[PDB]
DNA sequence: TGCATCCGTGAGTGCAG
DNA sequence: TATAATGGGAGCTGTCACGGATGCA
């Protein structure tokens, strides 16, 4: 009924490991990875392509997808097909099919066995842009990293190593999805560096710092200008439905005029131009108001310099740049009687 | 269960993954049962531990590994003729002579004493310069009268037989060659017997050998992180698992095999399917494989 | 079967805001 | 990238009335 207390229950189900079962499962995984490349130098198929096929059968056919990065679309035909040239092996080689399958299965019970830990880390990372659960998954997401990169031989408890990859992936998601406008993680990184050092400045000043007092405590390469434009991208957008008043029958977005779409004054204006300019082409000449009518365009424009002007006009190259001048020239005295073009410069 | 029926999470694991339950014993307290062991609910598992379902139990982490090492060797013993029972071998626990009165078994060489006591019984090895001179076998009923590391001349009393005397239980009389002289006979029994040596397995360690497998010398009984602290099998013997961390009382069915297996681990299967060894062994229940 | 009992849905106009 | 760390945390409160779908003697 409440989606956390639920997950908190599924977790209370897989019991906590003990030091032996830690090392047993940890142990069975490392061997199964070794077992896969040994199991790929006997067959030469491919480390990953194989590992996915070990994964398929152990977890059940409940799931299967063409894993991007493997070169065949992993449909249950190439799993029977490849579980076959695999199970086809001599007991001292197909020895290691048994080794992988057992190891994949330890992977599972080692993740499932350490979910409680992630809970109690992501618990501390709330109020940061990400929902509890959202933090949890991101947390677990790392936890997956931690098993495939553990070394039981170092004699560490599993807690100690995973409590790094967990909080590495929380902090990455807290910095890669939180903002409506996503910003590079390293730019986030330094933003909080202002937030923190400004905060101490304020805690030493009895007042908030100025731009300058920040660029100083921020150090070298930091001027007042550059702390400013850093803030002006720290700036989170605001909701178009942000409520207006204390009843609620108004929305901050309604007071916002749409300036892209042309107003009717506007789109009417463009029509009495693009026609009262066709009202000054065929009034004095329509083939010198066609060679200059292709020195630009009535729609699309047609303007480079000297190259197509030299191709198909009727005449030679620097001769259209002259009836270009008499085109214009005829239009500057053309529009000394039909003076109804000045008003279009406003 | 019918199409379109609502199973809770646990009910799904039962149907899909199998029933099973693990139980801890108070560390050190031992197992009233042993690995591989088919057992049923209510059955006593340890002093405080009692199982609640059916199935085949299974050992988790033996803290104590014992290797009954096998010995087959010649040793002799001289006795009255009017007090031994002629047999061409002596099964353990078997009575082989009864003495009217106590009859001191005396040395038949000069040397130092290498006493090697057993559960019930004893070995006595004399040796001059470190070559070994004579190996006597006191059975049950004969009580030594020497200490380890002691001197004996010829004909001083090493032990005293008193009444019935019988082979021990761990220890066999393979063949028994007798010869008489005087009013006595002196046996060279081709004894057979085994000796316990309890190894310690550590949390960062794992026994890599079943319950009761055969090892020569050189075999590996236990692995661990650094090559030292590994336990290797000094010479011939067989394995015994005592003192587990806890025991998982699974509900499954076991099926041993002899050659190449045909089903990897993880696989699902129904009765009548071909597990391993060419087609000989095969499924009983509906279940999922654990090679 | 009849009748508690819960859950979801409504609850005036425009203008200033 | 390695001491170890393994089940959350705020609920919010004084309306109403009707109709439909669900539970229960």
């Amino acid at each position: 009924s409440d989606p956390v207390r639920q997950y908190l229950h599924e977790i209370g189900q897989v019991p906590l490991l003990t030091l032996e079962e830690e090392v047993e499962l940890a142990r069975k995984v490392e061997e199964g990875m070794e077992a896969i490349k040994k199991l790929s130098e006997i067959t030469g198929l491919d480390p990953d392509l194989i590992r996915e096929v070990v994964r398929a059968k152990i977890l059940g056919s409940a799931r299967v997808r063409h894993i991007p990065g493997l070169k065949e679309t992993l449909d249950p035909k190439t799993v029977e097909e490849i579980d076959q040239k695999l199970k086809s092996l001599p007991k001292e080689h197909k020895r290691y099919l048994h080794i992988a399958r057992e190891g994949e299965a330890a992977r599972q019970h080692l993740i499932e066995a350490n979910l409680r830990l992630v809970v109690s880390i992501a618990k501390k990372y709330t109020g940061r842009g990400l929902s509890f659960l959202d933090l949890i998954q991101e947390g677990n997401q790392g936890l997956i990293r931690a098993v495939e990169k553990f070394e039981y031989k170092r004699r560490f408890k599993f807690s100690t190593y995973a409590t790094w990859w967990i909080r590495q992936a929380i902090n990455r998601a807290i910095a890669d999805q939180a903002r409506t406008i996503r910003i590079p993680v390293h730019m986030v990184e330094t933003i909080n560096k202002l937030s923190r050092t400004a905060r101490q400045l304020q805690q030493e000043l009895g007042r908030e710092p100025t731009y300058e007092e920040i660029a100083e405590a921020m150090g070298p390469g930091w001027d007042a200008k550059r702390v400013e434009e850093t803030l002006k991208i720290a700036q989170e957008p605001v909701s178009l439905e942000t409520p207006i008043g204390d009843e609620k029958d108004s929305f901050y977005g309604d007071f916002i005029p749409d300036e892209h779409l042309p107003s009717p004054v506007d789109a009417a204006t463009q029509s009495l131009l693009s026609e009262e300019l066709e009202k000054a082409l065929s009034k004095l000449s329509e083939r010198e108001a066609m060679v200059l009518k292709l020195r630009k365009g009535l729609i699309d424009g047609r303007e480079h310099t000297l190259e197509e002007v030299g191709a198909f006009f009727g005449v030679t190259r620097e001769r259209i740049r002259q009836i270009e001048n008499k085109a214009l020239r005829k239009l500057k005295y053309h529009e000394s009687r039909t003076r109804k073009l000045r008003d279009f410069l406003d | 269960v019918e199409k379109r029926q609502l199973l809770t999470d646990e009910e799904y694991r039962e149907l899909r993954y199998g029933k099973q339950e693990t139980y801890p014993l108070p560390p050190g307290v031992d197992a009233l049962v042993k690995d591989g062991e088919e057992v049923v609910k209510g059955q006593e598992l340890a002093p405080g531990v009692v199982s609640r379902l059916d199935g085949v139990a299974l050992y988790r982490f033996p803290r104590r590994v014992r290797v009954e090492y096998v010995k087959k060797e010649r040793a002799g013993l001289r006795l009255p003729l009017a007090a031994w029972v002629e047999k061409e071998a002596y099964k353990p626990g078997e009575i082989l002579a009864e003495l009217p009165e106590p009859y001191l078994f005396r040395a038949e060489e000069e040397g130092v004493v290498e006493l090697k006591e057993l559960e019930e019984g004893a070995f006595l090895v004399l040796r001059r310069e470190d070559e070994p001179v004579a190996t006597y076998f006191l059975p049950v009923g004969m009580t030594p009268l020497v200490v380890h590391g002691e001197i004996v001349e010829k004909g001083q009393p090493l032990a005293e037989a008193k009444g019935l005397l019988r082979m021990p239980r761990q220890v066999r009389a393979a063949q028994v060659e007798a010869e008489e002289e005087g009013e006595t006979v002196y046996l060279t029994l081709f004894l057979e017997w085994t000796e316990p040596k309890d190894y310690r397995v550590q949390p960062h360690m794992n026994v890599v050998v079943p319950e009761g497998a055969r090892v020569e010398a050189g075999d590996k009984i236990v692995a661990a992180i650094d090559p030292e602290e590994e336990v290797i099998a000094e010479a011939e013997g067989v394995v015994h698992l005592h003192e587990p961390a806890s025991i998982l009382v699974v509900k499954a069915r076991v099926y041993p095999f002899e050659d190449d297996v045909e089903v990897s681990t993880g696989d699902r299967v129904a009765p009548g399917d071909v597990l391993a060894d060419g087609g000989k062994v095969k499924s009983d229940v509906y279940g999922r494989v654990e090679v």
Side-chain angles (χ1 to χ4, degrees), chain A residues 212-275:
Chain A
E212 272 80 347
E213 313 183 70
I214 257 102
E216 205 209 283
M218 280 286 283
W222 277 109
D223 63 4
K225 173 182 64 172
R226 181 163 165 269
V227 30
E228 198 179 326
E229 35 230 49
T230 257
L231 297 182
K232 93 148 165 181
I233 49 210
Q235 261 171 5
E236 282 248 50
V238 61
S239 180
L240 266 184
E241 302 78 12
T242 326
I244 275 299
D246 250 304
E247 327 133 299
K248 304 83 192 174
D249 58 303
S250 58
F251 282 159
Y252 170 114
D254 295 296
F255 308 115
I256 279 176
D258 178 15
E259 357 221 11
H260 182 103
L261 226 162
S263 131
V265 172
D266 299 350
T269 303
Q270 209 271 18
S271 253
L272 203 249
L273 177 48
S274 222
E275 203 260 324

Side-chain angles (χ1 to χ4, degrees), chain A residues 45-308:
Chain A
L45 261 19
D46 145 293
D48 307 71
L49 174 31
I50 282 159
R51 196 199 50 267
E52 223 54 50
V53 154
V54 208
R55 196 120 59 187
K57 295 281 197 220
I58 179 71
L59 275 165
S61 276
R63 160 199 341 187
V64 62
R65 213 244 161 188
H66 63 97
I67 301 277
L70 325 181
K71 214 36 104 74
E72 244 91 4
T73 58
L74 290 202
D75 62 76
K77 179 208 60 68
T78 332
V79 75
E80 218 51 296
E81 275 224 340
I82 289 327
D83 203 26
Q84 281 324 305
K85 73 182 64 178
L86 286 164
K87 89 92 174 313
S88 318
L89 273 221
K91 68 159 168 280
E92 99 265 3
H93 271 4
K94 171 262 223 69
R95 169 186 168 62
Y96 306 136
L97 205 86
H98 301 102
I99 300 298
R101 295 265 200 117
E102 248 281 307
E104 269 319 308
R107 193 158 173 277
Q108 319 290 306
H109 191 2
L110 189 69
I111 309 168
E112 312 180 82
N114 290 269
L115 294 178
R116 275 158 160 104
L117 185 66
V118 191
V119 161
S120 288
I121 305 161
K123 90 150 69 155
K124 307 205 284 173
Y125 283 70
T126 50
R128 292 258 228 119
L130 277 225
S131 26
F132 198 3
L133 282 122
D134 256 75
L135 297 182
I136 277 213
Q137 293 312 90
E138 290 301 346
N140 303 341
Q141 175 128 271
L143 172 68
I144 286 194
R145 295 289 60 216
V147 308
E148 313 191 3
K149 297 203 201 310
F150 194 43
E151 304 173 339
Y152 71 114
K153 288 190 187 206
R154 307 217 191 180
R155 324 297 278 294
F156 297 120
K157 234 170 183 306
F158 182 66
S159 53
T160 296
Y161 180 62
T163 291
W164 193 96
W165 290 83
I166 287 142
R167 52 177 57 151
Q168 198 70 23
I170 289 176
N171 277 294
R172 195 217 32 109
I174 268 151
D176 177 60
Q177 11 182 263
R179 291 152 146 286
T180 317
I181 306 249
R182 177 198 109 81
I183 59 192
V185 186
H186 57 87
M187 193 73 43
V188 178
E189 201 82 287
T190 50
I191 290 194
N192 312 263
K193 236 227 290 173
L194 293 62
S195 268
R196 191 176 42 261
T197 54
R199 281 227 320 262
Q200 68 201 18
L201 309 189
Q202 186 196 246
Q203 205 150 81
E204 174 144 1
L205 295 224
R207 58 149 172 86
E208 70 154 5
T210 88
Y211 288 166
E212 272 80 347
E213 313 183 70
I214 257 102
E216 205 209 283
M218 280 286 283
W222 277 109
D223 63 4
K225 173 182 64 172
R226 181 163 165 269
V227 30
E228 198 179 326
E229 35 230 49
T230 257
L231 297 182
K232 93 148 165 181
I233 49 210
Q235 261 171 5
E236 282 248 50
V238 61
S239 180
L240 266 184
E241 302 78 12
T242 326
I244 275 299
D246 250 304
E247 327 133 299
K248 304 83 192 174
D249 58 303
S250 58
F251 282 159
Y252 170 114
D254 295 296
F255 308 115
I256 279 176
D258 178 15
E259 357 221 11
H260 182 103
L261 226 162
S263 131
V265 172
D266 299 350
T269 303
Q270 209 271 18
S271 253
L272 203 249
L273 177 48
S274 222
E275 203 260 324
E276 230 216 273
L277 60 70
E278 214 51 39
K279 204 174 303 313
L281 286 222
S282 337
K283 221 165 191 62
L284 312 181
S285 209
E286 190 71 339
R287 64 75 211 179
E288 71 183 7
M290 74 102 193
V291 292
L292 199 227
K293 202 178 183 181
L294 257 295
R295 280 298 358 253
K296 299 225 179 68
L298 197 162
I299 209 97
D300 139 82
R302 227 302 309 164
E303 35 226 312
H304 193 179
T305 286
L306 46 85
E307 302 84 14
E308 167 68 357

Side-chain angles (χ1 to χ4, degrees), chain A residues 9-10 13 18-21 23-24 27 57-62 83 87 89-91 94 97-98 101-102 152-153 155-156, chain B residues 9-10 13 16-17 60-61 63 202-206 225-226 229 245 259-267 288-291:
Chain A
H9 183 93
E10 319 187 303
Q13 295 310 116
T18 208
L19 184 31
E20 285 109 311
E21 7 201 18
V23 204
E24 176 183 340
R27 189 211 315 145
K57 295 281 197 220
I58 179 71
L59 275 165
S61 276
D83 203 26
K87 89 92 174 313
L89 273 221
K91 68 159 168 280
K94 171 262 223 69
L97 205 86
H98 301 102
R101 295 265 200 117
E102 248 281 307
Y152 71 114
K153 288 190 187 206
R155 324 297 278 294
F156 297 120
Chain B
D9 217 11
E10 305 75 315
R13 283 186 285 270
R16 178 77 176 171
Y17 296 109
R60 290 322 295 156
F61 301 92
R63 321 193 190 273
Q202 282 298 300
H204 291 286
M205 324 207 292
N206 47 298
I225 74 141
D226 320 282
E229 101 204 358
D259 207 11
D260 192 32
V261 196
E262 279 319 344
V263 319
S264 233
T265 216
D267 291 300
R288 69 167 339 211
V289 78
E290 192 170 1
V291 148

